[PDB]
Design an enzyme around this catalytic site. Structure first.
Site, PDB file in Angstrom:
ATOM      1  N   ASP A 160       0.603  -1.069  -0.107  1.00 41.91           N
ATOM      2  CA  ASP A 160      -0.259  -0.102  -0.161  1.00 41.91           C
ATOM      3  C   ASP A 160       0.703   1.206  -0.047  1.00 41.91           C
ATOM      4  O   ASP A 160       0.469   2.508   0.244  1.00 41.91           O
ATOM      5  CB  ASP A 160      -1.036  -0.177   1.606  1.00 41.91           C
ATOM      6  CG  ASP A 160      -2.752   0.977   1.008  1.00 41.91           C
ATOM      7  OD1 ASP A 160      -2.676   1.411  -0.214  1.00 41.91           O
ATOM      8  OD2 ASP A 160      -2.629   1.197   1.819  1.00 41.91           O
ATOM      9  N   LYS A 162       2.010   5.205  -0.920  1.00 43.36           N
ATOM     10  CA  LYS A 162       0.985   6.161  -1.588  1.00 43.36           C
ATOM     11  C   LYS A 162       1.770   7.485  -0.241  1.00 43.36           C
ATOM     12  O   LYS A 162       2.336   7.234   0.507  1.00 43.36           O
ATOM     13  CB  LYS A 162       0.032   5.950  -1.758  1.00 43.36           C
ATOM     14  CG  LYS A 162      -0.897   5.666  -0.366  1.00 43.36           C
ATOM     15  CD  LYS A 162      -1.874   4.820  -0.635  1.00 43.36           C
ATOM     16  CE  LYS A 162      -3.230   4.985   0.714  1.00 43.36           C
ATOM     17  NZ  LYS A 162      -4.574   4.606   0.333  1.00 43.36           N
ATOM     18  N   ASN A 165       1.082   7.189   3.115  1.00 43.50           N
ATOM     19  CA  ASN A 165       1.025   5.937   3.823  1.00 43.50           C
ATOM     20  C   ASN A 165       2.397   6.868   4.711  1.00 43.50           C
ATOM     21  O   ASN A 165       2.990   6.591   5.510  1.00 43.50           O
ATOM     22  CB  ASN A 165       1.102   5.389   4.307  1.00 43.50           C
ATOM     23  CG  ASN A 165      -0.225   4.280   3.223  1.00 43.50           C
ATOM     24  OD1 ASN A 165      -1.447   4.786   4.235  1.00 43.50           O
ATOM     25  ND2 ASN A 165      -0.675   3.648   3.049  1.00 43.50           N
ATOM     26  N   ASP A 178       0.541   2.401   8.230  1.00 47.37           N
ATOM     27  CA  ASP A 178      -0.541   1.718   7.833  1.00 47.37           C
ATOM     28  C   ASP A 178      -0.130   0.323   7.315  1.00 47.37           C
ATOM     29  O   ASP A 178       0.652  -0.091   5.918  1.00 47.37           O
ATOM     30  CB  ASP A 178      -1.159   3.015   6.779  1.00 47.37           C
ATOM     31  CG  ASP A 178      -2.945   1.688   5.861  1.00 47.37           C
ATOM     32  OD1 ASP A 178      -3.033   0.661   6.810  1.00 47.37           O
ATOM     33  OD2 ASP A 178      -3.263   1.943   5.809  1.00 47.37           O
ATOM     34  N   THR A 195      -4.730   0.306  -3.198  1.00 50.10           N
ATOM     35  CA  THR A 195      -4.625   1.231  -3.927  1.00 50.10           C
ATOM     36  C   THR A 195      -4.815   1.799  -5.211  1.00 50.10           C
ATOM     37  O   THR A 195      -3.494   1.918  -5.949  1.00 50.10           O
ATOM     38  CB  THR A 195      -4.779   3.266  -2.755  1.00 50.10           C
ATOM     39  OG1 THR A 195      -4.217   2.730  -2.393  1.00 50.10           O
ATOM     40  CG2 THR A 195      -4.688   4.169  -3.393  1.00 50.10           C
TER      41      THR A 195
END
Ligand SMILES: Nc1ncnc2[nH]cnc12
EC number: 2.7.11.11
Lengths: 344, 18
Positions: A160, A162, A165, A178, A195
């Site tokens: 994840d 991005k 985060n 996260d 995502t």
């Protein structure tokens, strides 16, 4: 090339794995309780709850407490992912991974209490300034490269990446937060998660996949940091997926030649050609011309001057975060979902 | 410009996971 520098990396990762596995096999549990903390303000939200700034009463330290509603976790079919998240976060130890200080649960919720990273999300700074310069983006990207080298050596995939985060600490360095999709796996896995803007083509197309999806996501992150927008965007997710699998990417005219070459090798649909997934592993990335100025050891030791230091009004201040609607923390008089979360 | 197209799009805010 496998020389002295590569053997030092190898020996460092071997000791790191010994320490990780001890905690992986014997996880910490029930190390605080809710009334040890005063709740101050919401720092962000997600599908299962919210991350709150809290103050630890006995020490006066500030922390970030992630709160997950057990019933909502069950409805979203995220039980095993949530057990992954906490079991992994309590076992890891690396300069650019946020530290878990306590964890516990009650009748209604799960709680993970982490170091408070006061500088805000990279997302906020990136959107406000528009785009980062290439040296700026390179400074952050180098930290992610080392963090993935660490995680992947422990058979962990992150899944994840991005800017939302990536938190900026008081020294201007990154802390990854996260771990809701992090997973320890040898071989391949199949879960459709992440995502939309950051998904590798093999995820979208329902193939088995491995840690190479993190290196694709690094390509998306570097592009977004240096351009100000991601390489595949649209108003609807289905349109994003069509662009990702098409095999085509276009670059702003201000991207250097080295940057475009690195991104063509990271944003590579052909897995036999994607940097990070070849015989040389991460070293195809670390030795690329775009990283020629990067001193990898100095980055790890946090001795490189950061592009900026976040503003700090004082302890417990949240000026680098958006404001969110505040909602109660309700604890039911009946235990919810006890068997499902018994190991948390 | 591609930047202007991004800024006018519906996905410049925080992006939720799937
Ligand atoms: N979202 C967040 N904000 C600040 N510090 C954090 N530590 C862990 N998650 C955090």
């Amino acid at each position: 090339k496998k020389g002295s520098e590569q053997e030092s990396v190898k020996e460092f990762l071997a000791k790191a794995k010994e320490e990780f596995l001890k905690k992986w096999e014997s996880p910490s549990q029930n190390t605080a309780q809710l009334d040890h903390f005063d709740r101050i303000k919401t720092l962000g939200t997600g599908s299962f709850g919210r991350v709150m700034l809290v103050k630890h009463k006995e020490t006066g330290n500030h922390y970030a407490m992630k709160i997950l509603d057990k019933q909502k976790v069950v409805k979203l079919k995220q039980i095993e992912h949530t057990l992954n998240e906490k079991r992994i976060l309590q076992a890891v130890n690396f300069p650019f991974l946020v530290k878990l200080e306590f964890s516990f649960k009650d009748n209604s919720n799960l709680y993970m209490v982490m170091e408070y990273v006061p500088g805000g999300e990279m997302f906020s700074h990136l959107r406000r300034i528009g785009r980062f310069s290439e040296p700026h983006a390179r400074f952050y990207a180098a930290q992610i490269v080392l963090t993935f080298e660490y995680l992947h050596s422990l058979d962990l995939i992150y899944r994840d990446l991005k800017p939302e985060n990536l938190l900026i600490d008081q020294q201007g360095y990154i802390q990854v937060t996260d771990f809701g999709f992090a997973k320890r796996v040898k071989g391949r896995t199949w879960t459709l998660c992440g995502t939309p803007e950051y998904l590798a083509p093999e995820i979208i197309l329902s193939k088995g996949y491995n840690k190479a999806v993190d290196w694709w996501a690094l390509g998306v992150l570097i592009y977004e940091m240096a351009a100000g927008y991601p390489p595949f965007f649209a108003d609807q997710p289905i349109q994003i997926y069509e662009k990702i699998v098409s095999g085509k990417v276009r670059f702003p005219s201000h991207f250097s030649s080295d940057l475009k070459d690195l991104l063509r090798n990271l944003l590579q649909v052909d897995l036999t050609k994607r940097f990070g997934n070849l015989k040389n592993g991460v070293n195809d990335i670390k030795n690329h011309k775009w990283f020629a100025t990067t001193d990898w050891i100095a980055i790890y030791q946090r001795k490189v001057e950061a592009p900026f230091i976040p503003k700090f009004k004082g302890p417990g201040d949240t000026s680098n975060f958006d404001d969110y609607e505040e909602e109660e923390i309700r604890v039911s008089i009946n235990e919810k979902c006890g068997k499902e979360f018994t190991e948390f | 410009t591609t930047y202007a197209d991004f800024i006018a799009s519906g996905r410049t805010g925080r992006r939720n996971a799937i």
